[PDB]
Write an enzyme that holds these catalytic residues in place. Structure first.
Site, PDB file in Angstrom:
ATOM      1  N   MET A 113      -1.910  -0.629  -1.028  1.00 43.14           N
ATOM      2  CA  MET A 113      -0.592  -0.261  -1.529  1.00 43.14           C
ATOM      3  C   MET A 113      -0.251   1.159  -1.098  1.00 43.14           C
ATOM      4  SD  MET A 113      -0.386  -1.831  -5.378  1.00 43.14           S
ATOM      5  CE  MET A 113      -0.247  -3.591  -5.670  1.00 43.14           C
ATOM      6  N   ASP A 114       0.967   1.346  -0.597  1.00 43.07           N
ATOM      7  CA  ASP A 114       1.455   2.661  -0.213  1.00 43.07           C
ATOM      8  C   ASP A 114       2.142   3.313  -1.413  1.00 43.07           C
ATOM      9  OD1 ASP A 114       4.454   1.950  -0.005  1.00 43.07           O
ATOM     10  OD2 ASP A 114       3.531   0.508   1.367  1.00 43.07           O
TER      11      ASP A 114
END
Ligand SMILES: CCCCCCCCCCCCCCCCCC(=O)OC[C@H](COP(=O)([O-])OCC(O)COP(=O)([O-])OC[C@@H](COC(=O)CCCCCCCCCCCCCCCCC)OC(=O)CCCCCCCCCCCCCCCCC)OC(=O)CCCCCCCCCCCCCCCCC
Ligand SMILES: CCCCCCCCCCCCCCCCCC(=O)OC[C@H](COP(=O)(O)OCCN)OC(=O)CCCCCCCCCCCCCCCCC
Ligand SMILES: CCCCCCCCCCCCCCCCCC(=O)OC[C@H](COP(=O)(O)OCCN)OC(=O)CCCCCCCCCCCCCCCCC
Ligand SMILES: NC(=O)C1=CN([C@@H]2O[C@H](COP(=O)(O)OP(=O)(O)OC[C@H]3O[C@@H](n4cnc5c(N)ncnc54)[C@H](OP(=O)(O)O)[C@@H]3O)[C@@H](O)[C@H]2O)C=CC1
Ligand SMILES: CCCCCCCCCCCC(=O)OC[C@H](COP(=O)(O)OCC[N+](C)(C)C)OC(=O)CCCCCCCCCCC
Ligand SMILES: CCCCCCCCCCCC(=O)OC[C@H](COP(=O)(O)OCC[N+](C)(C)C)OC(=O)CCCCCCCCCCC
Ligand SMILES: CCCCCCCCCCCC(=O)OC[C@H](COP(=O)(O)OCC[N+](C)(C)C)OC(=O)CCCCCCCCCCC
Ligand SMILES: CCCCCCCCCCCC(=O)OC[C@H](COP(=O)(O)OCC[N+](C)(C)C)OC(=O)CCCCCCCCCCC
Ligand SMILES: CCCCCCCCCCCC(=O)OC[C@H](COP(=O)(O)OCC[N+](C)(C)C)OC(=O)CCCCCCCCCCC
Ligand SMILES: CCCCCCCCCCCC(=O)OC[C@H](COP(=O)(O)OCC[N+](C)(C)C)OC(=O)CCCCCCCCCCC
Ligand SMILES: CCCCCCCCCCCC(=O)OC[C@H](COP(=O)(O)OCC[N+](C)(C)C)OC(=O)CCCCCCCCCCC
Ligand SMILES: CCCCCCCCCCCC(=O)OC[C@H](COP(=O)(O)OCC[N+](C)(C)C)OC(=O)CCCCCCCCCCC
Ligand SMILES: CCCCCCCCCCCC(=O)OC[C@H](COP(=O)(O)OCC[N+](C)(C)C)OC(=O)CCCCCCCCCCC
Ligand code: SF4
Lengths: 95, 50, 368, 48, 353, 175, 55, 71, 69, 115
Positions: free
Chosen positions: A41-42
């Site tokens: 996840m960014d």
């Protein structure tokens, strides 16, 4: 009446279900599963998951906690410590 | 300077009370008097000569 | 709508005139076309007038109701929308409406007959007079809107007169007449949806069993815009319908859950949301109100049409020939039944039904 | 003469200060009238 | 015919009397709206309505007919209960109150020893009609009016009720017609001038008339509880409010100015001596005179209702609450003790005869 | 299914009264038209300097109340919408909502150059070039501002139009 | 303690609404005065040669 | 004391109130005779609440503090 | 100006037909000296009555009976 | 004078790292109020589509590098957030915001006029 009825296993079980509705890398999610590395996840993807987890447990992560949370287990610990039932009207309790 | 046009609605309202009073005072009094003449309609309606 | 409706800035009409469009396609722009929209104050008429006038096309709107025409002028700029007081029994009034028009769109039609007009007079007589007057005025294009089940041999007065109307128009105006067969149209204040949204729908067991292929009204008006400005559509017949077949009973129950009438279990039955009546009684009540009620009610012919389902003529053309994809009722169902929701009022949370939510609700309705 | 001008002597003075003189009897007189009306009114009520 | 008609009329005679009675009240209420606009106009140096019917005599008809030809706005047609329950309760409350108003001796539809109680009780029902409009309403201006309406009721209800009880205590009767006849020698305006002012102030508060027009303050709550009303619901509420103005003006004439009693006894005898008491013409004239006496006194206070509107600014409702409880209630309660002390002192305790 | 439409039946605005029912419904229309013309209730919708002249119509010199004209604060109780002032883009959605909240029958009056076509602010980035872009206008009153008599003349024109309505005779002859 | 008017005098004005009746009387005076209304369109307001109207 | 006359008046008053609503329902022209914007139950822009032009939060069932509750 | 005596004087000077036409459009009974007529047919009058106010000394009598423009 | 609801004091952030946190904090506030945006303005789309729209608008300025531009962008985003939450916008504006909608060839533009 106004007390938490959560358990560590139920909170973890519902946390996994919410996170499996996204495009995470792995479907094997536990307490030690990290958002950045294991889930891939960014910045914006992580905040989408955190808000989605907020909707499930009706809790609101604070700014400091949300900007420093790393693992799913920390999310589980926050929900257990801070969750409260929403106050009902006068008629719901005494009637 | 008395504005007579402003007094026209009051005159009609004055006639409004008089309409109720004139009808009620006369029709009710006549009905009671008519029924006190006798037990049959031939006496209540028809007025004798004597 | 888009930003510029025409495919080119120069168009040559069937009568030889050359029309040049000016502007980018806004309110102040012009297309060089003048169109007459008979029945422009009706349900479909307002959509058609709005689409034509918003791009600068001059619109001539014959009318009989003076208050109903006022809202049409807002669509166009100054001098774009013009009004002519007309009656289908006045030949001079009709000839004035089509004198300066390059396109004539006949939206005049009825499902009822009144003390002044029969079903034949409006569906056949009015269409023939408009078509013949248009040809004598040298109008390049004529567009006639029939019904979805138009069939001259049909046992229903509405379907038969619509079927004859198609033939009488082609004989008068000529082979250059385009005929449109729209399905029941759903939209804001749509007659197809108004009957379903009515709480006290008498005889719902007999009327709401009809199966149709509902089509978006905005697309029907969009299709007419395509047909009018494309000479390649002349002489053709277009059946406008949606892909998904629906029965009115399914729509009635699906709407009932959207309106949240069922929040109280007793209320739908007590309020009269179900009014089972024998068909012979409905025939008698429809027959009586045909001469007592001053407003058009559910009449005898509509009772016949409840037993007739919508059949699609395969030989005719569709949205594919016009380069369009029909809109799905599930996508637009919520936004057109939203005004009738009981309370909503952002009390706790609005229940917004998406495309997938409506389809799931259809399964619940048919689930016993 | 060839313009719009005031007269040679000028315009007469106007009224612009506040002019709201008091009117009516003294408050004590109104109080006595109320007591006199109340006294006479109860007298006629008592007789009836 | 003939014989079967001359008893059919007798069978339906009393329904004509009631219909005439209803028309008599409606005419006064209808032309009170015209009179109020005409009266304020000249006080404001305008004219008022003079171009709807000859000299404006059809102004009331046009306003009513135009509104009766207006669309009724409601969320659904079946919601006719919500916007009509309020006005109908208010209208029925004031119309039923007119039953105990005697235009002459015994000329009232309802005669009872408890007419005073029926009058006050019927008027209190009209307050419930106003609060019905604010039925969990989505209109914020409708809601604010309902809160103000309840506040005004707490102000005048105690004051208005006690003032009427003092007049009833003075006559020892709760019958309106007995109260009227008890004023033959003295009109209660003279002994109870403070109460007449207090009664009129309470009447203004009850009818939500200025300077107590906080319920329908245009500059505060656009239209109050009527902001969401149109066509017939607006008419019924408008009719009920003006019917209360006539009723309260008539009540002031009854309690303090002798009701239908003549201004001059000598003039009353002279006019009636011109007519024979053996003919019905005497009783037609007698009803005109007795109601004419009531009409003149009632028209003066209907004029005064308009007069105070054109001369005084609006008072805040919270100031009105302090006005009644701190000033009006102590004064009226003081009088309710003062009056029996006077009567007992001079051996003049009242009895009914 | 044979239809024989007459060709020379005059339109409603030209159609004379032939039978007894024509006079009946014309009487019905005139009673309503007189009532609405006499009970002319505009809505208090003053936007800009045009509203000042609208106030002077209610002034004692002209006394609009003498004609039965009363300004109502709520759209429910008003049937006339007088757009007196400049209509801005920030204001246009509010104007449309208020117009939609008026029950029928309803009329709109456009007063002043701002409401008619934008006037002095026609080439402004935040001004609507005519209220007719939002709502249908029945009568346009010219002037900057139109005088109190100019507005009264426009109201008289609208009342003349209202008295010519044939709503109930239209149902009898046109429907 | 420094009021010029006695308590009874100040109470008489206060209880009997001295200034309210004064305001009512002034309003009633206008009721017997000539109004300002002109009967348009049968009568017209003043105009000047400098007036700007239709072009 | 006889109250038959009073009873007839009360009956008439109840009927009279329904006449005003019945007359208004039978006198107004049908929507199709007007601009034909359809039934009021569908014209949501008209049946909505009045908020002086701008829509605001919907607080129909919110608590309303009352400063004169003790009075 | 609003007195009933002024109306009675104007009623007598004008007559029944003239005053009734004023009672239909003018909402007021007025009399005056004829000044002239225009091409459309309207008649114009000037009032010499001392009780008339400043702005009401000139008025028109339109040709129509029910409508005025 | 008290500031209105959800009003922030304008400040110029001189640290790029601090600016990133403020944007992330504001990004979550938009997501949390997505359902409120649907309820207040009565949208025809679910709250899930609103959050997708919010993400798309935020991603349009993801690669902005100049710090002075970030402060203006963040400040205007705070003003936009305050406008939506306080229901100051009319429902028409929000409806048109979500009513935002292969280009035409050279000949297609040529035949119609192009720009
Ligand atoms: C009654 C006594 C009056 C009288 O007989 O003559 C005046 C009155 C007409 O006034 P007027 O003679 O033309 O006035 C004199 C000059 O014209 C004009 O003279 P003026 O207007 O200059 O007179 C001024 C005078 C006011 O003029 C008066 O004298 C009228 C009296 C007003 C006070 C009493 C009421 O003084 C005032 O302005 C102050 C009065 C108001 C003060 C506050 C109220 C005090 C009470 O004569 C009549 O009585 C007839 C009119 C009455 C109405 C009849 C029609 C009613 C409508 C029926 C339905 C149709
Ligand atoms: C108190 C001052 C005295 C009042 C006058 C007394 C009086 O006139 O009584 C006469 C009246 C008739 O009764 P009678 O038995 O004939 O008395 C003998 C008369 N020669 O006796 C009566 O009927 C009494 C009539 C009432 C007496 C006056 C009541 C005054 C009310 C108090 C004023 C309140 C205001 C402060
Ligand atoms: C409808 C029914 C009728 C209702 C209305 C009834 C009307 C009758 C009203 C009766 C009560 C009125 C009382 C008036 C007398 C008492 C008032 C008074 O005299 O003043 C109070 C006085 C204080 O003196 P002070 O007023 O301050 O004088 C100096 C100011 N420069 O205080 C004193 O010195 C004495 C204390 C008062 C003693 C008398 C009480
Ligand atoms: N679901 C649907 O609505 C469907 C529509 N159609 C047909 O499409 C066409 C458009 O109708 P639509 O807008 O949908 O709904 P409407 O039936 O309300 O439209 C009817 C139009 O034709 C006019 N009209 C009817 N009779 C007359 C007459 N004697 N003289 C003049 N005008 C008349 C009407 O004018 P006015 O309003 O002034 O009276 C109105 O403009 C109709 O012909 C209809 O039969 C067929 C299948 C589906
Ligand atoms: C006595 C009197 O005046 O009775 C004549 C009457 C009414 O007169 P009025 O002035 O309208 O009565 C109103 C009374 N006020 C002026 C006090 C309000 O006249 C007729 O129409 C009969
Ligand atoms: C009260 C009596 C009401 C009868 C109305 C009526 O009979 O009206 C119905 C008919 C038909 O005409 P329509 O109403 O336009 O038809 C449209 C509506 N339908 C199709 C449902 C019928 O009209 C007439 O025959 C008019 C007669 C007028 C008589 C004088 C009033
Ligand atoms: C405040 C003034 C009240 C008023 O003017 O009314 C009081 C008196 C009259 O009434 P009274 O003397 O109290 O009793 C009634 C007396 N009769 C029998 C003469 C009617 O009115 C006038 O004579 C005027
Ligand atoms: C009590 C209610 C009264 C109603 C008053 C309004 C009547 C109206 O408006 O009447 C208008 C009507 C008709 O129109 P007209 O003006 O005659 O035009 C028609 C032009 N002809 C005469 C040349 C054909 O006239 C009447 O013959 C009404 C008769 C009523 C019985
Ligand atoms: C019962 C319910 C309550 C009462 C409701 C009453 C409302 C008032 C009436 C509206 C007035 C109106 O409209 O009259 C205005 C109209 C004028 O119409 P116009 O458009 O200006 O000109 C158009 C008319 N031409 C072309 C003729 C000029 O006069 C008339 O034609 C009146 C003439 C008709 C005959 C009158 C006498 C017949 C007897 C009437 C009484 C029984
Ligand atoms: C009779 C029953 C009807 C009237 C009842 C009410 C009258 C006033 C009561 C209090 C008076 C008071 O308190 O008087 C005192 C005041 C003010 O005088 P001051 O400031 O002391 O003057 C200073 C000292 N001087 C007197 C030496 C100059 O007088 C007034 O303002 C009188 C008001 C008169 C106009 C209104 C009268 C008509 C009212 C309308 C018709 C009903
Ligand atoms: C014993 C004899 C009893 C007299 C009976 C009558 C009493 C009347 C009330 C007196 C007290 C009062 O009006 O009080 C005024 C009150 C409260 O004022 P406050 O906050 O205390 O400030 C004032 C006190 N100062 C100066 C010490 C600070 O508010 C008001 O302005 C109420 C205005 C109501 C006006 C209604 C008039 C309607 C027309 C009536 C004429 C036809
Ligand atoms: C007292 C005032 C009298 C004057 C106004 C009368 C208006 C009623 C007549 C009317 O409405 O006539 C027109 C009507 C029908 O036409 P509509 O407009 O669609 O009816 C709408 C009215 N509903 C709701 C009753 C259908 O005709 C008829 O067959 C009437 C039966
Ligand atoms: C009754 C006394 C009042 C009558 C006034 C009147 O008949 O009023 C005249 C009417 C309405 O027309 P208007 O423009 O309001 O006339 C006012 C003139 N102004 C503007 C100069 C003031 O015209 C007519 O006669 C046309 C309709 C025929 C007669 C219908 C009468 C109304 C029915 C209800 C009452 C019987
Ligand atoms: S038109 Fe002229 S007077 Fe009217 S609002 Fe605009 S600027 Fe003001």
């Amino acid at each position: 009446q106004s007390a938490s009825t959560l358990t560590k296993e139920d909170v973890l079980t519902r946390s996994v279900s919410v996170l499996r509705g996204f495009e995470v890398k792995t479907k094997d999610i536990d307490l030690q599963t990290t958002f950045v590395q294991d889930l891939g996840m960014d910045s914006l993807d992580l905040n989408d998951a955190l808000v989605a987890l907020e909707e499930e447990f009706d809790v609101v992560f604070d700014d400091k906690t949300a900007n420093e949370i790393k693992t799913v287990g920390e999310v589980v610990d926050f929900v257990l410590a801070n969750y409260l039932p929403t106050e009902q009207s006068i008629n719901h309790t005494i009637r | 300077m008395i504005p007579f046009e402003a007094l026209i609605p009051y005159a009609i309202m004055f006639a409004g009370f008089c309409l109720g009073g004139g009808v009620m005072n006369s029709a009710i009094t006549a009905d009671i008097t008519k029924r006190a003449r006798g037990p049959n309609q031939e006496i209540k309606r028809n007025v004798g000569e004597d | 709508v888009s930003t510029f409706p025409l495919k080119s800035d120069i168009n040559i009409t069937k009568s030889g005139k050359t029309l040049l469009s000016v502007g980018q396609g806004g309110r102040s722009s012009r297309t060089g076309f003048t169109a007459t929209v008979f029945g422009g104050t009706g349900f479909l008429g307002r959509v058609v007038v709005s689409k034509l006038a918003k791009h600068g096309t001059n619109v001539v709107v014959p009318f009989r109701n003076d208050r109903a025409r006022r809202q049409l002028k807002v669509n166009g700029d100054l001098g774009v929308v013009n009004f002519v007081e007309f009656d289908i029994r006045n030949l001079k009034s009709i000839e004035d409406s089509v004198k300066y028009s390059d396109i004539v769109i006949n939206l005049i039609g009825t499902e009822h007959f009144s003390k002044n007009f029969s079903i034949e007079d409006v569906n056949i007589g009015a269409a023939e007079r408009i078509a013949k007057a248009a040809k004598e005025a040298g109008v390049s294009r004529l567009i006639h809107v029939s019904s979805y089940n138009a069939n001259p041999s049909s046992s229903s007065d509405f379907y038969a007169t619509k079927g004859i109307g198609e033939q009488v128009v082609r004989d008068n105006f000529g082979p250059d007449a385009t005929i449109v067969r729209p399905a029941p149209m759903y939209f804001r204040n749509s007659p197809f949806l108004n009957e379903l949204l009515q709480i006290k729908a008498l005889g719902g067991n007999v009327i709401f069993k009809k199966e149709v292929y509902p089509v978006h009204a905005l697309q029907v008006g969009e299709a007419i815009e395509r047909i009018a400005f494309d000479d390649a559509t002349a002489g053709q017949t277009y059946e406008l319908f949606g892909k998904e077949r629906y029965s009115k009973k399914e729509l009635r129950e699906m709407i009932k859950h959207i309106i949240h009438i069922g929040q109280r279990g007793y209320y739908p039955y007590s309020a009269g949301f179900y009014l089972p009546a024998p068909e012979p009684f409905l025939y008698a009540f429809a027959l009586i109100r045909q001469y007592i009620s001053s407003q058009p009610r559910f009449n005898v012919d509509q009772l016949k049409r409840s037993h007739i389902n919508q059949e699609i003529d395969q030989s005719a053309k569709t949205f594919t020939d016009l380069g369009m994809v029909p809109d799905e009722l599930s996508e637009y169902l919520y936004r057109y039944v939203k005004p009738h929701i009981s309370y909503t009022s952002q009390t706790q949370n609005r229940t917004v039904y998406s495309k997938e939510d409506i389809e799931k609700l259809r399964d619940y309705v048919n689930t016993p | 003469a060839t313009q719009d001008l005031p007269p040679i002597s000028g315009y007469a003075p106007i009224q612009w200060k506040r002019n709201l003189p008091s009117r009516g009897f003294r408050p004590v007189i109104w109080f006595l009238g109320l007591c006199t009306a109340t006294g006479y009114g109860f007298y006629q009520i008592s007789l009836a | 015919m003939l014989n079967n008609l001359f008893d059919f009329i007798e069978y339906i005679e009393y329904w004509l009397i009631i219909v005439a009675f209803v028309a008599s009240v409606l005419i006064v209420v209808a032309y009170l709206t015209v009179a109020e606009r005409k009266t304020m106009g000249y006080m404001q140096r305008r004219l008022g309505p003079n171009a709807v019917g000859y000299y404006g005599v059809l102004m009331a008809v046009a306003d009513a007919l135009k509104l009766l030809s207006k669309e009724i706005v409601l969320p659904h047609n079946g919601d006719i209960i919500y916007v009509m329950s309020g006005p109908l309760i208010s209208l029925f409350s004031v119309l039923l109150s007119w039953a105990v108003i005697p235009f002459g001796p015994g000329l009232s539809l309802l005669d009872s020893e408890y007419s005073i109680i029926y009058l006050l009780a019927s008027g209190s029902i009209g307050v419930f009609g106003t609060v019905i409009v604010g039925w969990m309403s989505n209109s914020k201006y409708t809601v604010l009016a309902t809160v103000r309406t309840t506040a005004q009721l707490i102000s005048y209800e105690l004051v208005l009720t006690t003032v009427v009880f003092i007049i009833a205590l003075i006559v020892s009767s709760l019958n309106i017609n007995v109260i009227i006849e008890s004023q033959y020698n003295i009109w209660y305006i003279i002994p109870f001038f403070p109460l007449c002012l207090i009664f009129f102030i309470s009447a203004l508060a009850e009818t939500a008339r200025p300077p107590f027009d906080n319920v329908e303050a245009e500059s505060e709550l656009v239209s109050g509880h009527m902001t969401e009303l149109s066509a017939s619901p607006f008419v019924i509420f408008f009719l009920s409010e003006y019917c209360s103005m006539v009723l309260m003006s008539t009540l002031t004439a009854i309690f303090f100015f002798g009701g239908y009693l003549p201004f001059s006894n000598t003039i009353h005898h002279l006019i009636l001596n011109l007519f024979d008491q053996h003919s019905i013409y005497y009783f037609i004239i007698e009803g005109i005179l007795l109601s004419g006496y009531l009409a003149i006194k009632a028209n003066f206070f209907m004029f005064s209702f308009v007069w105070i509107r054109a001369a005084a600014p609006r008072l805040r409702y919270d100031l009105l609450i302090l006005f009644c409880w701190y000033v009006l209630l102590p004064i009226v309660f003081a009088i309710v003790v003062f009056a029996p002390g006077i009567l007992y002192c001079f051996d003049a305790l009242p009895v009914i005869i | 299914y044979s239809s024989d439409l007459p060709t020379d039946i005059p339109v409603l605005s030209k159609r004379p009264h032939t039978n007894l029912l024509d006079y009946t419904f014309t009487t019905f229309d005139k009673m309503k038209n007189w009532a609405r013309k006499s009970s002319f209730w505009p809505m208090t919708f003053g936007l800009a300097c045009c509203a000042v002249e609208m106030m002077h119509v209610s002034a004692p010199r002209y006394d609009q109340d003498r004609l039965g004209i009363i300004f109502r604060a709520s759209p429910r109780q008003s049937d006339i919408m007088i757009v007196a002032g400049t209509v801005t883009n920030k204001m246009a959605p509010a104007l449309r909502q208020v117009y939609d909240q008026m029950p029928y029958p309803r009329w709109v009056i456009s007063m002043g150059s701002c409401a008619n076509g934008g006037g002095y602010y026609h080439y402004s980035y935040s001004v609507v070039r005519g209220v007719d872009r939002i709502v249908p206008v029945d009568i346009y009153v010219p002037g900057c501002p139109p005088t109190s008599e100019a507005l009264m003349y426009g109201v008289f024109q609208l009342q003349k139009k209202m008295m010519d309505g044939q709503t109930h005779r239209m149902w009898y002859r046109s429907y | 303690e420094e009021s010029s008017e006695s308590a009874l005098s100040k109470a008489t004005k206060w209880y009997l609404l001295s200034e309210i009746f004064r305001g009512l009387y002034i309003t009633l005076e206008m009721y017997f005065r000539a109004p300002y209304t002109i009967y348009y369109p049968f009568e017209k307001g003043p105009v000047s040669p400098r007036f700007r109207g239709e072009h | 004391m006889l109250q038959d006359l009073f009873n007839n008046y009360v009956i008439l008053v109840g009927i009279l109130g329904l006449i005003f609503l019945g007359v208004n329902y039978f006198i107004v022209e049908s929507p199709r005779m007007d601009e034909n914007n359809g039934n009021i139950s569908d014209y949501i822009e008209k049946s909505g609440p009045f908020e002086c032009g701008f829509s605001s939060f919907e607080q129909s069932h919110n608590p309303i503090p009352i400063a004169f509750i003790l009075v | 100006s609003s007195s009933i005596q002024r109306t009675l004087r104007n009623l007598w000077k004008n007559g029944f037909k003239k005053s009734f036409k004023q009672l239909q459009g003018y909402n007021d009974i007025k009399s005056g000296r004829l000044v002239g007529t225009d091409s459309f047919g309207n008649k114009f009058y000037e009032v010499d009555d001392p009780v008339e106010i400043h702005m009401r000394t000139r008025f028109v009598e339109y040709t129509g009976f029910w409508r005025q423009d | 004078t008290n500031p209105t609801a959800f009003a922030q004091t304008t400040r110029y952030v001189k640290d790029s790292t601090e600016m990133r946190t403020l944007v992330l904090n504001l990004y979550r506030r938009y997501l949390r109020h997505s359902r409120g945006f649907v309820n207040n303005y009565n949208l025809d789309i679910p709250a899930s589509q609103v959050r997708t729209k919010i993400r798309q608008e935020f991603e349009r300025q993801r690669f902005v590098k100049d710090l002075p531009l970030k402060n203006v962008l963040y400040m205007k985003a705070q003003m936009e957030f305050q406008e939506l939450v306080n229901f100051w916008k009319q429902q028409c504006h929000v409806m048109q915001y979500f009513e935002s909608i292969k280009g035409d060839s050279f000949v297609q533009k040529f035949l119609k006029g192009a720009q």
